Amino acid sequence: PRAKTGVVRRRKHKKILKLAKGYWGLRSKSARKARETLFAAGNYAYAHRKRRKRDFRRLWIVRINAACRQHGLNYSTFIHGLKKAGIEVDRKNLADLAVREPQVFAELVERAKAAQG
């Protein structure tokens, strides 16, 4: 018996055209400009997740530095402090203490330079 393509192709194609919503021009309309685009989109996302995880390490650091620069010392030194003090805690994420509750930050700094006389 004969098994013509039938319905099947139209569907692989509009599965993929759904994924292509909002791409510029033909990238959202062509069965296969969409396709191409989406490989690259896919890789971008994957690596870009990796990066997001480094992109924030970075952000935190820079406002940590900022704030502890406000009390004389700097980030190189400040981390030494926390390290020795045993408070591997901060976790650059959570030195948003820099902003909400600097009170608390102030202390942390003090404890930090105390490990260093």
Binding site: L38, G86, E107
Partner: protein
């Protein structure tokens, strides 16, 4: 009050009423968990060294759940290499009850 608890190799600034999600805790669906894992307080506890000693924050596990699906796709050019991963991170939702140290 305040509290910086740690679970999943991740820390979080919790408070008397909220939490979000945080990775499989082997906890019965509706049970209680103490996150004795603990740093900080809202009247400056700090931690002399890492964990403030007999301090614990109680949270109530609301339930479990897979996160929203991510599509992980890999592609290599001029070498026919195409790959689909559907991924959903499961977690548990907690509600912070009290921070008792």
């Amino acid at each position: 009050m305040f509290a910086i608890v740690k679970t999943g190799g991740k820390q979080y600034r919790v408070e008397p009423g909220l939490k979000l999600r945080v990775e499989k805790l082997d906890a019965e669906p509706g049970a209680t968990v103490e996150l004795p894992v603990l740093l900080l307080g809202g009247e400056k506890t700090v931690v002399g060294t890492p964990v403030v000693e007999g301090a614990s924050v109680v949270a109530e596990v609301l339930g479990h759940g897979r996160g929203k699906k991510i599509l992980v796709s890999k592609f290599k050019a001029k070498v026919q290499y195409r790959r689909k991963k559907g991924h959903r991170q499961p977690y548990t939702e907690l509600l912070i009850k009290e921070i008792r140290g």
